[PDB]
Amino acid sequence: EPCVEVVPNITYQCMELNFYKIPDNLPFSTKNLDLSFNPLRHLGSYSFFSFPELQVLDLSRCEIQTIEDGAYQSLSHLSTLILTGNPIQSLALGAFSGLSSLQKLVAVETNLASLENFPIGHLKTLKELNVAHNLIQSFKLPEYFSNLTNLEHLDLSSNKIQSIYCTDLRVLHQMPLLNLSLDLSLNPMNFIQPGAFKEIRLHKLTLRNNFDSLNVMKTCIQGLAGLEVHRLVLGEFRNEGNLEKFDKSALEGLCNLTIEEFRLAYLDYYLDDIIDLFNCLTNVSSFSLVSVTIERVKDFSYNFGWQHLELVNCKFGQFPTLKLKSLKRLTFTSNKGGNAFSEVDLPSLEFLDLSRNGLSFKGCCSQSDFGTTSLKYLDLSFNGVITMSSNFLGLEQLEHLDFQHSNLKQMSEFSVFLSLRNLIYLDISHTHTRVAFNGIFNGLSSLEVLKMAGNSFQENFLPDIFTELRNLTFLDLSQCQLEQLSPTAFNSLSSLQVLNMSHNNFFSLDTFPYKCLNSLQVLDYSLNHIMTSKKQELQHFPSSLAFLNLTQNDFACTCEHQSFLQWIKDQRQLLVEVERMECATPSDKQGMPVLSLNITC
Amino acid sequence: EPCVEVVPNITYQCMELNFYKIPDNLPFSTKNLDLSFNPLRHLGSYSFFSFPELQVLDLSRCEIQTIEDGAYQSLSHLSTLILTGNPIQSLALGAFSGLSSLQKLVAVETNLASLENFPIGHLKTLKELNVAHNLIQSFKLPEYFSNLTNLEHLDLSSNKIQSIYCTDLRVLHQMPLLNLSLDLSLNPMNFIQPGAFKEIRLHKLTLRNNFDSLNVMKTCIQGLAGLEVHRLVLGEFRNEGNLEKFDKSALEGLCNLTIEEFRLAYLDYYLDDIIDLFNCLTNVSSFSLVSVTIERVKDFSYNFGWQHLELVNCKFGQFPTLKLKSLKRLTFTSNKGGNAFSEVDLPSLEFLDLSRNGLSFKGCCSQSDFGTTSLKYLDLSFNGVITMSSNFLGLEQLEHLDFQHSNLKQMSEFSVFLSLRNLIYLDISHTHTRVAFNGIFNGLSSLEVLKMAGNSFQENFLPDIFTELRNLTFLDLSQCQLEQLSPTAFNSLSSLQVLNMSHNNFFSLDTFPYKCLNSLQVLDYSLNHIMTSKKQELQHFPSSLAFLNLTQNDFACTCEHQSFLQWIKDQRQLLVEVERMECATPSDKQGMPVLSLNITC
Amino acid sequence: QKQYWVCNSSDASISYTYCDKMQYPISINVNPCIELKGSKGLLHIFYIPRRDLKQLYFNLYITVNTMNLPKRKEVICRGSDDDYSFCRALKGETVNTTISFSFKGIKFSKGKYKCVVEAISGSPEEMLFCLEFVILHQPN
Amino acid sequence: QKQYWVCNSSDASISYTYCDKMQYPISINVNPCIELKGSKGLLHIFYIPRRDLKQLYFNLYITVNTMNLPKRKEVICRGSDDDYSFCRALKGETVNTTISFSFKGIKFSKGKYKCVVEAISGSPEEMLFCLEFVILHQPN
Numbered sequence A, B: 001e002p003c004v005e006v007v008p009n010i011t012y013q014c015m016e017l018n019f020y021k022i023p024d025n026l027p028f029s030t031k032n033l034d035l036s037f038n039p040l041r042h043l044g045s046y047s048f049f050s051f052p053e054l055q056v057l058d059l060s061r062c063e064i065q066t067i068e069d070g071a072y073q074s075l076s077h078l079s080t081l082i083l084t085g086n087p088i089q090s091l092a093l094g095a096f097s098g099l100s101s102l103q104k105l106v107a108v109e110t111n112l113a114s115l116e117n118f119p120i121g122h123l124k125t126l127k128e129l130n131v132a133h134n135l136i137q138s139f140k141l142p143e144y145f146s147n148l149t150n151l152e153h154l155d156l157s158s159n160k161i162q163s164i165y166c167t168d169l170r171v172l173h174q175m176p177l178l179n180l181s182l183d184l185s186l187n188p189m190n191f192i193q194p195g196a197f198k199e200i201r202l203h204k205l206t207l208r209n210n211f212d213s214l215n216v217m218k219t220c221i222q223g224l225a226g227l228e229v230h231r232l233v234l235g236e237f238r239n240e241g242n243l244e245k246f247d248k249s250a251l252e253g254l255c256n257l258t259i260e261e262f263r264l265a266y267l268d269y270y271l272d273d274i275i276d277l278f279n280c281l282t283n284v285s286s287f288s289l290v291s292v293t294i295e296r297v298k299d300f301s302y303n304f305g306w307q308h309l310e311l312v313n314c315k316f317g318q319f320p321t322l323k324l325k326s327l328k329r330l331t332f333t334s335n336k337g338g339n340a341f342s343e344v345d346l347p348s349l350e351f352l353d354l355s356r357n358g359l360s361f362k363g364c365c366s367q368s369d370f371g372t373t374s375l376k377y378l379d380l381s382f383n384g385v386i387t388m389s390s391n392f393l394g395l396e397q398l399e400h401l402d403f404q405h406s407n408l409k410q411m412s413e414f415s416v417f418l419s420l421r422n423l424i425y426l427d428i429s430h431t432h433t434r435v436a437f438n439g440i441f442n443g444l445s446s447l448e449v450l451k452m453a454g455n456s457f458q459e460n461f462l463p464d465i466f467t468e469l470r471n472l473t474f475l476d477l478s479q480c481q482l483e484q485l486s487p488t489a490f491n492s493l494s495s496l497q498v499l500n501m502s503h504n505n506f507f508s509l510d511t512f513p514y515k516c517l518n519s520l521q522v523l524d525y526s527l528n529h530i531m532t533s534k535k536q537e538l539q540h541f542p543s544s545l546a547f548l549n550l551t552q553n554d555f556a557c558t559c560e561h562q563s564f565l566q567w568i569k570d571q572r573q574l575l576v577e578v579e580r581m582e583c584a585t586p587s588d589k590q591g592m593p594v595l596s597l598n599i600t601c
Numbered sequence C, D: 001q002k003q004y005w006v007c008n009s010s011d012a013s014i015s016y017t018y019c020d021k022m023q024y025p026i027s028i029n030v031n032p033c034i035e036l037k038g039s040k041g042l043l044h045i046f047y048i049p050r051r052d053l054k055q056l057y058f059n060l061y062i063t064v065n066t067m068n069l070p071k072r073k074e075v076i077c078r079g080s081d082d083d084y085s086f087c088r089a090l091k092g093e094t095v096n097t098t099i100s101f102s103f104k105g106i107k108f109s110k111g112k113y114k115c116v117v118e119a120i121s122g123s124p125e126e127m128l129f130c131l132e133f134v135i136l137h138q139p140n
């Protein structure tokens, strides 16, 4: 079978196989046939009959000239067509004749000329229709749209469209119920007569890099009057030519509409003031900026009503100062410019995310740095340097907290987590810290998840700090250069199930510290160098244990302490990969699995 | 002997022993006798005869009332007197009668009243004279100073002096050669008539916290005219009351003098502009500031002629911008305020020191960040975060460099030290790095000292990076969590003498990697866990070796590999502390020194 | 294999070949020819993909005259509302673009620097293509 | 040993005794009495040293109800041109000063906090004195 079977009897793909006609030896009840880069200079009536059931088809770059009538006749349940790249010089009328249930249709790079010479009038339940990169001239919607229903997208971008007229969209007035996420980008256009968009209701609209100068943009915005969109997107694309100047004079009057979301993307100019700009873009229940470089602005503070804000991949000189009276979520990620921090006042806020920026702190954490009183989530990972000088005072309702891959300071000088009495999640990983104060985890009486991997210990001996954590279940401490454990550390932790203790430097193994843990299932000793036990007092493990790594470490195969190997081969019902436990200390016994070999003496 | 002998037959001290007269049972040829807190209500003629030779004396708080004539008569070579705290109501004239060679004299808290009733007229070669915390009224130098010569200090501070007059210092006009480091601080004074200091030449002058308001300071500075001092010090003390206001109006006219150094200390006001302040303090060949808080100043840049600058324990908002045409040394240490960095332009500079500040970098190192062309020294230790994005280009003459306890980034992505072909010193210690690129030390063809302790390695295996370093002698790599070494790493390093390899995690010992190193003397294996060798192929070490730590690690005492203990006890002429090598692996053999025990089997 | 030459400068001799078995053609050009000292110019690319070049990215395996380096990972365009225009295309659709580039600030010694490129894309994240570059360097 | 009381507040009962054998007297006072919640006030000290209190500094051994802490090292005045006036005195010379202090921003739980003070000074760097503090704390 030249056509590759990737999944048997349902999906069969074969591309670039130099065919000249439809392959038939494929199974009868096949679905989602792929067919690409196979020259089919012309398609014939009933070209697809041996596949009565069929979900997906594809004809991508299969050079097609003319599709005649009757095609796809003996064919139902076909939900997808992809007619990409095939230069069609004559689409025969009546094509797509029998298609009971079609939803998606894609015709890209097909040399079309208009929309009314497109024979989908009998269709229904068609949801998406992508027709882009063509040669179209007028944005005059044909009439069969009245018949059409449940259409959602109509993406006609990067064409040779020039202007609009009120006569257009005279249809679609008679649609009491309609959702249309219209779109048109990269179009060279310069004029819209007023009144065109009127009493219409969309659900999105994207216009990026379709204007050549500022006055054109002003006129075009004047062209929109009463659109009432739910989401609008403006900007440009880096790859091509863009605008030269941008001020408060531009973008003005945009508040003759009724908007509820905004999204500007990739300005190439060094904007310098955000106040009296974006001015009547208030009451917009969301706001966002992407890849804009406002490198010098002074008064970021103002009174907008914004319930959601995003600043992604921007640039800055200062950390922005904010004063919003109703802002429930903030997201300030992946920024590059400044490395500092300042006070903000967000009296009603319930979500933070300051990740990957690389900024620094001082006197990190207190209710006076965010002005709030009820903050439920908080993340500070991948920043530069944080200094602790106040245990979290005034934040008695906080349930999520992360600090991984930051650089902490002064973490072991006092009880840093002392007021948070309702906490569930906590992660301090790969921060260059040094635990040297028993009772640093004092006050956390509800923690259940605890992560710390890569944090040294004083003289490499585990102290007795795990007390009052009576709900902990998932405890993570690995890559911490331990060398020994306290005899009674894991006491009263009667709810642990996972316990990661891999990649450390141990030499002995003992069962006494884990004597009374009635809920363990997983136990991890992977990347250590364990040679023996303190002696053969190795007790039973708690019955509940059913999983135990003991692999990936060098053993010593001499008849000394052979009783240890006797004890380990005594219980094989808990190991994992018996083939990767092998000793290499004696030169002769090398690479030989442990449980296999039998020893003298 | 109640009087404690601290060093035999030369120095004997005894304080607080409740004596009532000079102890005599002390040896005859004793020096530097101490005597403190022993009540001697009155001193008698020839009180000190049994000590004909004597260098130092002391009578501190030994309550003295009257010293009569003839004292210290049978006494020469006595170079020091300390008459502290003893309230003297009558110093008998003719005292200090026979003192051939006296240099230092201290009389503090002695209730003096003037300076001419002080009988040192016959003295000579007296260098220092400290007389402070007394009750003096007039700064009228007596006349025997004409007889006096080689006097250097005269420290009369914290007295009840009120003003000065031109009649004062009429003496000391007739001194063609003279060095006097005069001083007077904490004096409540409010007026100096003009012309007092005229045609005089000092070598220091300190006036800290001796004025009560700004206008008083202006008048007093007007009082100085033509002083020609080599070093001047102003400011105040934190412990007491200070000034309320400070601007360019203050401190003006200070350039009627001829100064060459300046030092302001501990302003308590928030100064806000440094230009047009310190204005005619140009041509001053040095400048320094200590504990001043100029938290908001904009244009630090200006054209002064300053050949040396210091900013110690200051505070700042921004990192200062500098443009000096002739500044050969800079020292910017222990500051607190800002954490950033910027470009400077110092066209002729040969020394940097930016230590303990805690600031951060980006695009760290290139000749465009310091504008210079010949920089010989450089130190960047104890800062926050440094990022490497350019190997040192344009700095082909740099001989000293340090980075310890910083936080480096991107150190292993390319040859970071590639243009420095004349380097001797280099230290990268406790920076959280990860060596994973062979040839990171490419281009350094003159290094001799190399330090790196606390820097991990990829998978804990030493690669072959030490090539072309044909002069290295002192190589430091410890606390790096090594677990094994390449077989041929230390080749062509035919000039090493010190080699620190302690505190790692080894298990085997082999002599092959160190086969051909004809210049080793010291070899360090201290805080490891060495149990045995790979086998008994342990060769001879290079003859030159004469020092070898093998202590502080746990051994295993079983007759298995007893040949290893035979081999180690075979050469004891290179060990260090044979008493701290003892095994603890077998429970019986614990704490017992190794070379002592003898084993069966 | 066949040798695909690109351009020559005073100190650069860029060239490239295929790495894996798939041999879908491609056309690349740079102007002006790079000098390994910090340059600036334009890069013209013409290609016809075979998978959805969406959330594309790059893996890079470098080699400095037989000394390897860590693996570099470059995210070209991600998620929604991307900076580049071309990375919303589909299969069979021709991509034809030009992008500007510039660098300066590092000294490279003589050698035979070699690079390995891996393009990954698609919602199931398969490879797209792979090439092998060769760059000589002889400072004057 | 003898019990040296200092002052009482709503939540503080500071007291102190000697640690080592030397028992050179000293006089300390604070106003107003510290509240272990962040306060501000003045501290009056009268003393008569026995060594040159020059380049003085402090070592601190803390104890939080039987849990030790690391050792703290405080440099009071150092080198030349120091901030404080008193630290240029000599033996036998009376020191009599007052200094202002203030703190706020940390919550301390109930307990029996205890501290160990070590003053080091002099050019040969000998100890000067040593004391033991006791601070109860019962928030209202």
Ligand SMILES: CCCCCCCCCCCC(=O)O[C@H](CCCCCCCCCCC)CC(=O)N[C@H]1[C@@H](Oc2oc(CO)c(OC(=O)C[C@@H](CCCCCCCCCCC)OC(=O)CCCCCCCCCCC)c(=O)c2OC)O[C@H](CO)[C@@H](OP(=O)(O)O)[C@@H]1O
Pocket: A336, B389, B390, B413, B414, C014, C030, C034, C038, C043, C060, C062, C101, C102, C103, C104, C105, C106, C108, C113, C115, C133, C135
């Ligand atoms: C196909 C070859 C395999 C890849 C070759 C190496 C690629 C390394 C990937 C990372 C490079 C990068 O980060 O981008 C940019 C240089 C672009 C690379 C050149 C395109 C290659 C063309 C290949 C086809 C042609 C045949 C560097 C950069 O930092 N960009 C951000 C920055 O730009 C801004 O400031 C920087 C600061 O340096 C300078 O940079 C410089 O001039 C020097 C810069 C790069 C030095 C290495 C350049 C390698 C050239 C390879 C030649 C190709 C021969 C085949 O310094 C560095 O950044 C060092 C970083 C570590 C480099 C390690 C590479 C060593 C490999 C050696 C292999 C021989 C810029 O000029 C510019 O200043 C004007 O800052 C801006 C923002 O201001 C930022 O934009 P953004 O904030 O929106 O993201 C840029 O992204």
Ligand SMILES: CCCCCCCCCCCC(=O)O[C@H](CCCCCCCCCCC)CC(=O)N[C@H]1[C@@H](Oc2oc(CO)c(OC(=O)C[C@@H](CCCCCCCCCCC)OC(=O)CCCCCCCCCCC)c(=O)c2OC)O[C@H](CO)[C@@H](OP(=O)(O)O)[C@@H]1O
Pocket: A389, A413, A414, B336, D014, D030, D034, D038, D043, D060, D062, D101, D102, D103, D104, D105, D106, D108, D113, D115, D133, D135
């Ligand atoms: C004798 C008892 C043993 C010692 C007790 C602990 C001493 C700890 C030494 C370090 C303290 C310190 O750094 O100074 C200062 C507080 C002074 C200590 C109080 C004097 C004790 C009197 C003893 C005799 C009386 C019986 C803190 C400080 O940071 N100072 C610099 C700073 O001041 C400035 O900004 C800070 C920012 O916090 C605030 O601080 C605060 O209010 C809180 C501060 C200290 C919290 C601990 C205070 C312990 C009091 C002990 C009570 C005594 C009972 C016997 O927060 C912190 O700094 C936390 C640092 C870690 C603290 C660990 C101690 C835990 C031990 C618990 C033992 C029970 C200041 O109010 C103030 O804001 C106005 O910044 C300025 C500059 O702006 C700086 O000046 P500088 O730049 O010129 O150096 C200050 O030095």
Ligand SMILES: *[C@@H]1O[C@H](CO)[C@@H](O[C@@H]2O[C@H](CO)[C@@H](O[C@@H]3O[C@H](CO)[C@@H](O)[C@H](O)[C@@H]3O)[C@H](O)[C@H]2NC(C)=O)[C@H](O)[C@H]1NC(C)=O
Pocket: A478, A499, A500, A501, A502, A503, A522, A523, A524
């Ligand atoms: C305890 O924590 C460690 C963290 O170090 C967990 O470890 C990780 O285990 C996975 C599974 O083997 C490793 O993934 C592997 O990567 C290789 C190379 O790509 C691949 O071939 C394997 O198939 C596998 O995917 C992973 O590298 C390793 N380390 C990390 C940092 O993730 C471990 O699972 C934890 N134990 C328990 C019981 O949770």
Ligand SMILES: *[C@@H]1O[C@H](CO)[C@@H](O[C@@H]2O[C@H](CO)[C@@H](O[C@@H]3O[C@H](CO)[C@@H](O)[C@H](O)[C@@H]3O)[C@H](O)[C@H]2NC(C)=O)[C@H](O)[C@H]1NC(C)=O
Pocket: A522, A523, A524, A526, A547, A548, A549, A576
């Ligand atoms: C012995 O160690 C190995 C690793 O060294 C354990 O492997 C298992 O590791 C994988 C990889 O992380 C875990 O994977 C799953 O990973 C996805 C990654 O996105 C995560 O989202 C899932 O929640 C899930 O954790 C896998 O869970 C983990 N095994 C177990 C049982 O959790 C291996 O498990 C260790 N041996 C034993 C008996 O656990």
Ligand SMILES: *[C@@H]1O[C@H](CO)[C@@H](O[C@@H]2O[C@H](CO)[C@@H](O[C@@H]3O[C@H](CO)[C@@H](O)[C@H](O)[C@@H]3O)[C@H](O)[C@H]2NC(C)=O)[C@H](O)[C@H]1NC(C)=O
Pocket: B478, B499, B500, B501, B502, B503, B522, B523, B524
């Ligand atoms: C190799 O590098 C290590 C650095 O870890 C050098 O080590 C240090 O050795 C000295 C001398 O024993 C240690 O000082 C000791 O401190 C204790 C406690 O105060 C004191 O009782 C001893 O008398 C001694 O002074 C020091 O702690 C130790 N570590 C460090 C970080 O300095 C070692 O000397 C180097 N080897 C060679 C041959 O240079």
Ligand SMILES: *[C@@H]1O[C@H](CO)[C@@H](O[C@@H]2O[C@H](CO)[C@@H](O[C@@H]3O[C@H](CO)[C@@H](O)[C@H](O)[C@@H]3O)[C@H](O)[C@H]2NC(C)=O)[C@H](O)[C@H]1NC(C)=O
Pocket: B522, B523, B524, B526, B547, B548, B549, B576
């Ligand atoms: C075995 O290890 C010990 C340390 O664990 C080596 O001790 C010696 O350590 C001292 C302390 O650092 C070195 O001290 C001198 O220290 C001053 C400190 O300021 C330094 O400025 C001097 O330049 C000097 O290094 C001492 O030099 C060092 N011993 C030697 C021979 O250098 C001990 O030396 C190790 N065993 C052998 C045989 O080296």
Ligand SMILES: *[C@@H]1O[C@H](CO)[C@@H](O[C@@H]2O[C@H](CO)[C@@H](O)[C@H](O)[C@H]2NC(C)=O)[C@H](O)[C@H]1NC(C)=O
Pocket: C007, C008, C012, C013, C136
């Ligand atoms: C571009 O540069 C390369 C490298 O210098 C040239 O290739 C070499 O070409 C010279 C001259 O023809 C030969 O002598 C060498 O044997 C070639 N070596 C290799 C490894 O190819 C190349 O010729 C240059 N291109 C042009 C058009 O001159």
Ligand SMILES: *[C@@H]1O[C@H](CO)[C@@H](O[C@@H]2O[C@H](CO)[C@@H](O)[C@H](O)[C@H]2NC(C)=O)[C@H](O)[C@H]1NC(C)=O
Pocket: D007, D008, D012, D013, D136
């Ligand atoms: C200062 O506070 C302390 C601590 O509360 C007081 O000491 C206690 O005093 C009460 C009342 O006299 C006694 O009942 C306790 O037995 C004491 N306990 C200890 C440990 O001393 C002290 O009395 C207070 N000072 C004054 C003047 O009231």
Ligand SMILES: *[C@@H]1O[C@H](CO)[C@@H](O)[C@H](O)[C@H]1NC(C)=O
Pocket: A152, A178, A179, A180, A203
């Ligand atoms: C289209 O609009 C309707 C209006 O109610 C909404 O329910 C639906 O979710 C929208 N379509 C999509 C894909 O969200």
Ligand SMILES: *[C@@H]1O[C@H](CO)[C@@H](O)[C@H](O)[C@H]1NC(C)=O
Pocket: A445, A446, A470, A471
């Ligand atoms: C968690 O802890 C709280 C208080 O410590 C306790 O009331 C509760 O029973 C524990 N378990 C769960 C599942 O909440």
Ligand SMILES: *[C@@H]1O[C@H](CO)[C@@H](O)[C@H](O)[C@H]1NC(C)=O
Pocket: B152, B178, B179, B180, B203
């Ligand atoms: C005093 O001044 C002279 C002037 O030549 C100088 O040589 C000498 O060093 C000075 N004294 C001190 C202690 O520096």
Ligand SMILES: *[C@@H]1O[C@H](CO)[C@@H](O)[C@H](O)[C@H]1NC(C)=O
Pocket: B445, B446, B470, B471
């Ligand atoms: C140091 O290295 C240089 C060049 O590598 C060499 O000329 C010199 O002999 C070496 N030794 C000394 C002591 O300079």
Ligand SMILES: *[C@@H]1O[C@H](CO)[C@@H](O)[C@H](O)[C@H]1NC(C)=O
Pocket: C046, C096, C097
């Ligand atoms: C790519 O587009 C440019 C636009 O003018 C065109 O000149 C060029 O021929 C196109 N590429 C190809 C391979 O045709």
Ligand SMILES: *[C@@H]1O[C@H](CO)[C@@H](O)[C@H](O)[C@H]1NC(C)=O
Pocket: D046, D096, D097
């Ligand atoms: C310390 O000086 C003040 C200054 O007025 C004085 O009142 C006090 O009595 C002095 N201390 C002693 C113990 O005399």
